Each structure stands twice: as structure tokens, then as C-alpha cells.
Amino acid sequence: ADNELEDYAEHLNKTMEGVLQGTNCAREMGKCILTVGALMTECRLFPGKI
Amino acid sequence: LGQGIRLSNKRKTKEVIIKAEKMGKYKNLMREEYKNLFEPLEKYIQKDVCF
Amino acid sequence: MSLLLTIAKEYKRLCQDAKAAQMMTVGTVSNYTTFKKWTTSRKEKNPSLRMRWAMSSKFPIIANKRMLEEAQIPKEHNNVALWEDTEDVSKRDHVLASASCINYWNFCGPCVNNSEVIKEVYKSRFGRLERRKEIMWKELRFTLVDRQRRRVDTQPVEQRLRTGEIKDLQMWTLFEDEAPLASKFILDNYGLVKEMRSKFANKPLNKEVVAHMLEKQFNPESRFLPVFGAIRPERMELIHALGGETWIQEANTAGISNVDQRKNDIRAVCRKVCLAANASIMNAKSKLVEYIKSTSMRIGETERKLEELILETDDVSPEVTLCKSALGGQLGKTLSFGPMLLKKISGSGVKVKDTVYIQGVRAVQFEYWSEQEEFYGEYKSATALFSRKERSLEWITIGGGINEDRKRLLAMCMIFCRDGDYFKDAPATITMADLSTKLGREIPYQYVMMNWIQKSEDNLEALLYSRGIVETNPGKMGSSMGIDGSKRAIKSLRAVTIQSGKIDMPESKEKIHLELSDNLEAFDSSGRIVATILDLPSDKKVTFQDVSFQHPDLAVLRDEKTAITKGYEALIKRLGTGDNDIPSLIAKKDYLSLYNLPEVKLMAPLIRPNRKGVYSRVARKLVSTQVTTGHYSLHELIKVLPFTYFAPKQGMFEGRLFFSNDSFVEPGVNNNVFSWSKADSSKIYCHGIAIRVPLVVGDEHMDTSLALLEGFSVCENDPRAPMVTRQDLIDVGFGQKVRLFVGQGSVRTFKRTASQRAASSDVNKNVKKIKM
Amino acid sequence: MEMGRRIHLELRNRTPSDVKELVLDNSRSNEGKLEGLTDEFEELEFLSTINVGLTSIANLPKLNKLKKLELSDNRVSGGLEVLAEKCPNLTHLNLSGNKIKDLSTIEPLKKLENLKSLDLFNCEVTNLNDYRENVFKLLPQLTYLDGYDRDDKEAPDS
């Protein structure tokens, strides 16, 4: 950061991320991102194999 | 006591000026070395000077 | 080399086929462009998903094969796949590979001698970073910013050019062997081409990338954006980090890449020439054109002609508009009325005269339009959206921010529409002396009233009073304007709404041709007067820096320096092609003839007679050394030839060659009396006057393909003359024909005799005769 | 221009074995490196390379009959031992305008027993204390320095 504006943006983002990382919906966000990433990289590599 | 201390935010974009007589009102902010140097003398202060 | 043989064998194989032979044989080369499209045609609906799907694969990057073998890049560094022998179906000259390979290449591949050239390729972006480093950020605040939607430019650029001019710049800075026939621009601006050429010559680079980046370098990105505060390219490039609708990040950006001072200087010069050329009633227009053509100004390092700068500029101002009209440049649909701006949104009309009695009974005719007509307006820090109707101001909605500017805008608008009783019955004060013919030219009524209001505030107050005043009804208090431009009052001007927030500027990408009258009244294919000379500052004195008014009337120097400058121009005027001239004599090593040229005989009297002999001996000696060896500096020769008229004598040479006017020239070091630089070898600065040298013969510094282009010219085709290389052009004899490949698919015939007379003069003279 | 074309131009069909003088001033040399020179030049007695963006001396072939050299306006620094093997019969050298910091770079020139005059002007070394004398004590064979002998004896024209 260099100017006051970035510090304000980073403080607000830190507060919101702290609030939002503890919920259960966000647990589902992580579970979807990771599981679908893995399933995407399996269906791409090993089709014809269940 | 000489010219009072000043405050400032992180980026130093804002800078306040206060007299000495009111430093006992913001002691919780000044650094330690400036704090340990002021409390033991608060007794002898009257308005802005030291007896 | 062998590669050449490979290309020839490939061409042979191509011609052996039948279809390829047909398509090559028929038509011209432009078909290539067409063929460039029928191939490699394939798009994708959702690129993101395709890229993510592809990257999972083992080898998602096509790549060259021979370059990998040469660079000793193995298939696997350590149990990691990088590529496998295969051929891409479409290209048929590439092999699949993986992205990991780049990392390996990045960390242990082939290293080039120097990569600092990138700083020149992307000079725009490095300029952006350098400018950003000098911004002192002050403090974020919060408030409802007033933003006006207006067209602006978002890239600071020097020497902004058109697409046509730029295309030659790319060809003449990278691909000279395939350059098209020399254009006017390349000849005029040869210092820029040399400067760009030096950086990107004898370098390993992807030429296309550099050309594209120079295209972006010379393009001022114009955008229609919301804006607040000053308007400067330095801000608009990062406005996103200065303020929005609800916040403001204060910052001082005044002293970075100043681009406004040169626009200001150009407008000042245009004002000066427009005010000069009003003396000649009969032929003001011709004097104006001659005045513009014989003037130039310095931009950074280079010196540019004022005529081209005016064409490139986009200053919608009354000064520039008239000059653009005279040259023939097309310009925007933007009117003016004093120091005010206007833009007709809608409506129409037709002239209708009406009388005005100036004092008692003195009829004076004035023309007024007759139809409804909406108009955006713009005075300093104020704006409006007014409308007129049959010589009446129907309404005006203002959205400015100042009271004084508001009043001035309202007054000039009322005048624009010739509303009010005063137009019917003139004010008592105005007299016939000021009515017209200040210098023998009639001044219509409206401009008389405009001058009246400027003369004194009381007249302005009276004019505003002329518009009816009513009582501010309830609720409308906020949308009301008093006499002092109050936001609200108890009594207010009739039908003068007021609001907060600047009126959004309209937009139209139209170009209208407009002529001008003998009195500099710019008509635009209809009655409208877009601009005139009676909407410019009266006069002011200024000391212009780095400018060249090479015209007699527009000069302040005395007969001495003017005589010396004229003599040097004459000496440089014998540098043209043909026998009995300086270059040919140098080729024939006949230095002796130079001492008896007519221009040296004319210039000899000036030389200081007391020691003319001693100077003559030194300068007569240097030329021989330069002439005989074949290593010479053309500029020094021109500088010291005036002294070679007289008989040598004996004496001590201090170091400087004086004239009869206490002005000297030292042989080798640039000084005010005579200057030049190796960067721009096509200019001679005599007492701050730019004398263009023709490009008929190269010099050790200036030597390149360009320094001869002017000498050559086209002629009737003769197939007997030989076909030579571009480099051999230097060796051809004067007045000798030669065939030459030019550009692409053009074989022409060039004769080394300079025949480029002025085209404008002949056409003008002949056309004037048609009117007798 | 370029040393290649410049040279090919100066050589008006003349073999590179019968010339006694050559000039390459106001040209450019890629990588600040000589390009196009060989041992074919035998009768050469003079050379001049000025303002060519030069920075080093590595591609210099062997020239015996050479007896005068000029490298002004470039940025050469460090390479001064090749002269003892390529041009051992050299007498006059000039380096004004190049990057020279210390004296250790100059020491090799002692082996040029045929050395008579040297020219160092505008170099960083010149900004030292008691430098003319230290150099003279290093290169005794030398007599002229920058056009001036000990005691400030101006040298003749030629």
C-alpha cells in the first residue's frame, strides 16, 4: 500500500473476510471449489474410467 | 513547558497540534519513553507549567 | 545464404503446381490480404471454459521444433513431461509441448546480450510508471462529487499524428528495403524517423510488435467519460484512483508531462497571426495562408511546421477554427460566441432582418433567426441548456457552480438570441462611433451589445433587468436566480431555472466543411457564423520561445543578421542537384570552383576586411582536407565557404571567423550565429532561424538511405537503364537514369534531378487568372 | 552507418593488403565490438575509430606494421594487454574520452618498448594527485604525454 485509499480498502476487506470466513455457507463454497476442481481434472484426464 | 506534542495518522496525511497543558488528556497515546517521563511530574503541574 | 536457395526452391515447387501458379499470376499483390483471411478461421464461444479445460492436458502449447533442439531443451528434465514428437494438424510445422517448458526456458535457457530495448518498445507504459512515481497523495475524503460526462483524451502523447502518416513511420523505421515512395511527411519530419530508426536498428526483435506499439504510442485515446476537476491527460489515465461519485483521493499532479503549455502557445500564435493578417482588407486570406506556411515551432527536440500542427490539433477554439478553415481542414460541429462555447442540439431557422434605433432615429439592420432552437452552452465553470424561439429566449436551465460565471453565461446567451427590448430600442449610451468601422469594417448589433456588457458591470445589470423579474413562487425558490446569481431569493429572473450538477456535454462524430469570407467570417454551408475575428482578445504582448517567424513583415531583427541569414539560405540553395553545384563539384574534387561561386561573391563584402586574408587561408585549407580525403562535414563546409572569396595572406589565427558586425563563427563548435546537431542534420539555426537543407547528398553523421531521397525523382520509363540496389543510390551520377523496385510490386524509373516545385503557388496563380 | 559497409566503401576495389591508412569515424559497431577486421591488413600504418559506441577490444586481429592508433569518444575500459602481442611496434596511442578508472589497467603498456607518446584527457585517472609523474615512472620509455613532455615541452606538429 502507498496511499490512504488502499489502506481503507484493505481494512474493510479484512473485516469482511474475517466475518465471512467463519460461516457454514463458506464451508460449502470451499467444498464446491475443491471437489469440482478435482472432479474436473479427473473427467479431463481419465474418461472411460469410473 | 515548550510547544506541545503533535499527533498524526499512519500515512501522516493529518497532523494535529496540541499544547502541553492538555497532554495529560491524551497520555494514553504518547509513547512509553514520553509517558514514563510525564506521569511522575503530573503532580507538580498546575495548568501548563511545572512547579 | 543457403536459406535464400531454400526460398527459391520453395518458390519453384509452388510454381510447379497449377492452382498456386494461377493465383500468383493473376491480379496484383493486394490479393494477399484477401488470402490472409480464408486461412486460419476458427473461433470459440466461451474462451474461459476452453482454456481451463485445455490446461489440464499434458501438453497444451504448440511450439517450434528446431528452436528447441538448438536450445538443447530435452523432453524431460527430471521425470516431468515437456513435449513429445508430433505435428500440429493445422500448422504442420510445430510440435505439442507443455507450459512447464517456459519455466525451464526462463530459468536456464538461452540468454540475450541485453533486454533494455523493451524500455523503448513500451515507452508509454514506462512513462506511466515514471509519472505515477511523482504523485504526492494527500488524503481520502468523502462527498458527492459532481461529474460531467465529456469527451477527453487519456494518453499523454507528443507529436500526435494521423493513421496515414504513422504507417510510413513504421515502414521507414523498420522495413526500409520495402519502404514506399517517399512521402511529404517523411521528408519534412526526418529527425523523428532518424531518432526512432537508431534505437531499433541492428537488433533482435519481433518487428511487428514494435510497429504495433508505435501505433499505440502515437494514438491519443479519446473516450467519453465522467469527469471532475481539471482536464489533463496526466489525470485521466488514472482518474479511476482519484475519485468517484462518493469519494475523492486528493493529489497534486500539476508538474508531470506538461501538455497544456504547447496547446496554449499554439493558440497564442494563431491569435497573433489572425490579428496581424487583418490589415489587408482586400487580400487578408492569402496573407493569412502565407503567414501560416512560413512559420514553425519547436516541439521537444524536433521543429514542426505550424500548418501540420493545426491540422493535428483538436482545440475547438475560435482562433484555431479560422486557421483550419483557411488551410481546408475539416473540423467539429462546435460554434462559438465570444469566450463562450455552444452546441446546437436541434432546430432550424432562416435570417430575418429587423431595425434598431441607436439614438433617437438611426436605423441599423440586424439579422435574427426564426425557429425553435436548443443549444448547449459552456462558460468557465458553468454550463447551460437553453432554447430560443422566434427572437425570444423560451427558457434556460443552468447547472453551474459560480454566480459571476452564471450571470455572464446568461447575458451572452440572451445576446445570442437577440431577445429583450434593447435590441428593439438600442441603449442610449452606445454611439455610432463604436457601432461599426473600428478599422473600416461593420460590426453587427449583437457584438456591439457584447462589447457593451464587457465594458461595465452596470450595463450587464441593466441587461439582466431587461428580462422580466417576478416573485419567487413557493417551492420554486431553489430553482431561481436573482441578479447576484443567488441560489434562491424572493424575486427572481423570469424563466431562469437553476439546478445543481453540470449539464452533460452532447457528442457527435461529424465533420463539416466551412469556408471563410474576405472579412474572416466562417460560413458552414449555411448562414451560421461559426467564428469571427471579433471574438478574440484585443491584444497582448508575449515573448515566444523556440519559434520561427521566417517572414519579413513578422520580424524584429535588423538588416545585418537578416542579410547573413539570407546569404546562408542562398548558399544552401546551390546545394541542389545538377552540374555546377556544390555536391557535383565535391564528387569531382573540384574544390577550386567553390571559391568563385556567385553566392560567395555576393557574401564576401560582409567579411571583416582587416583580416579577410587570414580567415580565407584557414577556411580555404580545411575544405581541401575535407574534399580530398573524402571525409567531410557538409555543415562546416557551408559555414566556412563565405570566406574563400579573397586571396590568402599571412597571419595568426586566433580561432574565430568574424563578420563586419562583431558576430563570429568558430570552426567546429556550435554557437548562436550558426548551430546544428548530429541528431537533426536537416536544420541550420542562424540567429534562431531554421534553414532547411535539402537532402541531396549524405554526410558522415547523417549518412543513411534518407539523406538522398529528395534528390531523386520519377521520370518516363526507360527499360535500358540498369536496376540497382537501394544502397548503391549514393554512387549514381547526377542526371543519370536508373530503374528501381519500390515498395511492393512496383518497378519504377528514377532520375537524380530534384524537380519538386511548389504546387500550391502555381494552382493559386492559374485559378486567379480564371477570374479575370 | 556500419563498419562493414563503411569499410567495403573505403575499399574501392583495393585489396586489403596494399593500404597504408584507414578511417572509420562516425560509424557504429554492434555490441561495441569490431567486425570485419582480419590479419589480411599487413601494410596498414594508421587507424582511426572515433565515436562508434565501442566498449572493448576483443576481436582485434594481429597487426604488425601498425604504428598509430586512435580510440577517442568510446567507452573502452580494461583491455590493454592485447597491444603487447598484436601491435608490439606501436608508438602513438590515444584514449581521451574512454572509461578508465585506475592505473592497474595501464600497466601492461610497459611491454610496448616502442611506445613514444600517449594521450589521456577527460578520464577519471586524470582527476588524481601526482599522476603524470607516477605514469612516467611506470612507463620510462615514454617521453610525450597528452602532447606534452616532462617540463611541459609542447610536441611538434608531426
From Swiss-Prot, chain A:
Q: Where in the cell is it found?
A: Host cytoplasm; Host nucleus
- Per the UniProt record, which residue ranges are transmembrane? none
Query: Posttranslational modification, per the record?
Result: Phosphorylated on serines and threonines by host kinases, including human casein kinase II.
Q: What is annotated about its quaternary structure and interactions?
A: Influenza RNA polymerase is composed of three subunits: PB1, PB2 and PA. Interacts (via C-terminus) with PB1 (via N-terminus).
Function in brief? Plays an essential role in viral RNA transcription and replication by forming the heterotrimeric polymerase complex together with PB1 and PB2 subunits. The complex transcribes viral mRNAs by using a unique mechanism called cap-snatching. It consists in the hijacking and cleavage of host capped pre-mRNAs. These short capped RNAs are then used as primers for viral mRNAs. The PB2 subunit is responsible for the binding of the 5' cap of cellular pre-mRNAs which are subsequently cleaved after 10-13 nucleotides by the PA subunit that carries the endonuclease activity.
Q: Which family is this protein grouped under?
A: Belongs to the influenza viruses PA family.
Q: What is this protein called?
A: Polymerase acidic protein
Organism whose genome encodes this protein: Influenza C virus (strain C/Johannesburg/1/1966)
Curated annotation (Swiss-Prot), chain B:
Task of the protein: RNA-dependent RNA polymerase which is responsible for replication and transcription of virus RNA segments. The transcription of viral mRNAs occurs by a unique mechanism called cap-snatching. 5' methylated caps of cellular mRNAs are cleaved after 10-13 nucleotides by PA. In turn, these short capped RNAs are used as primers by PB1 for transcription of viral mRNAs. During virus replication, PB1 initiates RNA synthesis and copy vRNA into complementary RNA (cRNA) which in turn serves as a template for the production of more vRNAs.
Q: Which organism is it from?
A: Influenza C virus (strain C/Johannesburg/1/1966)
Superkingdom of origin organism: Viruses
Cell compartments where the protein resides: Host nucleus; Host cytoplasm
Q: How is it modified after translation?
A: Phosphorylated by host PRKCA.
Q: How does it assemble?
A: Influenza RNA polymerase is composed of three subunits: PB1, PB2 and PA. Interacts (via N-terminus) with PA (via C-terminus). Interacts (via C-terminus) with PB2 (via N-terminus); this interaction is essential for transcription initiation.
UniProt-recorded name of the protein: RNA-directed RNA polymerase catalytic subunit
The record's similarity note reads: Belongs to the influenza viruses polymerase PB1 family.
UniProtKB/Swiss-Prot annotation, chain C:
This entry's Gene Ontology molecular function terms read: RNA binding; RNA-directed RNA polymerase activity
Which keywords appear in this protein's UniProt record, sorted alphabetically? Answer: Cap snatching, Eukaryotic host gene expression shutoff by virus, Eukaryotic host transcription shutoff by virus, Host gene expression shutoff by virus, Host nucleus, Host-virus interaction, Inhibition of host RNA polymerase II by virus, mRNA capping, mRNA processing, Viral transcription, Virion
Q: Which GO terms describe its cellular component?
A: host cell nucleus; virion component
Compartments annotated for it: namely: Virion; Host nucleus
Q: Which InterPro entries match?
A: Flu_PB2_2nd, Flu_PB2_6th, Flu_PB2_C, Flu_PB2_CAP-bd, Flu_PB2_middle, Flu_PB2_N, INV_PB2, PB2_helical
UniProt entry tagged with the keyword Amino-acid biosynthesis:
no
What Pfam families does this protein map onto?
Flu_PB2_1st (PF20947), Flu_PB2_2nd (PF20948), Flu_PB2_3rd (PF20949), Flu_PB2_4th (PF20950), Flu_PB2_5th (PF00604), Flu_PB2_6th (PF20951), Flu_PB2_7th (PF20952)
Organism domain of life = Viruses
Q: Name one GO biological process term.
A: viral RNA genome replication
Sequence similarity: Belongs to the influenza viruses PB2 family.
- Assembly and partners? Influenza RNA polymerase is composed of three subunits: PB1, PB2 and PA. Interacts (via N-terminus) with PB1 (via C-terminus). Interacts with nucleoprotein NP (via N-terminus). Interacts with host ANP32A (via C-terminus); this interaction promotes viral RNA synthesis.
Q: What is this protein called?
A: Polymerase basic protein 2
Q: Which organism is it from?
A: Influenza C virus (strain C/Johannesburg/1/1966)
As recorded in Swiss-Prot or TrEMBL, the protein's gene is named PB2
Curated annotation (Swiss-Prot), chain D:
UniProt-annotated location(s): Nucleus; Cytoplasm; Endoplasmic reticulum
Residue(s) carrying Phosphoserine: 17, 158
Q: In which tissues is it expressed?
A: Expressed in all tissues tested. Highly expressed in kidney and skeletal muscle, moderate levels of expression in brain, placenta and pancreas, and weakly expressed in lung. Found in all regions of the brain examined (amygdala, caudate nucleus, corpus callosum, hippocampus and thalamus), with highest levels in amygdala.
Modifications the protein undergoes after translation, according to the UniProt entry = Phosphorylated on serine residues, at least in part by casein kinase 2/CK2. The N-terminus is blocked.
Q: Which UniProt keywords apply?
A: Cytoplasm, Endoplasmic reticulum, Host-virus interaction, Leucine-rich repeat, Nucleus, Phosphoprotein, Repeat, Repressor, Transcription, Transcription regulation
Q: Name one GO biological process term.
A: nucleocytoplasmic transport
Residue ranges with Basic and acidic residues bias: 147-156
The residues bearing each LRR repeat, given as ranges, are 18-38, 43-64, 65-87, 89-110
Cysteine pairs forming cystine bridges in this chain are: none
Domain LRRCT, first and last residues per copy: 123-158
Which positions bear Phosphothreonine? Answer: 15
Q: Which GO terms describe its molecular function?
A: histone binding; RNA binding
Principal subcellular localisation of the protein: nucleus
Recorded GO CC terms: cytoplasm; endoplasmic reticulum; nucleoplasm; nucleus; perinuclear region of cytoplasm
The annotated subunit structure for this chain is: Component of the SET complex, composed of at least ANP32A, APEX1, HMGB2, NME1, SET and TREX1. Directly interacts with SET. Interacts with ATXN1/SCA1. Interacts with MAP1B. Interacts with ELAVL1. Part of the INHAT (inhibitor of histone acetyltransferases) complex. Interacts with E4F1. (Microbial infection) Interacts (via C-terminus) with influenza virus A protein PB2; this interaction promotes viral replication.
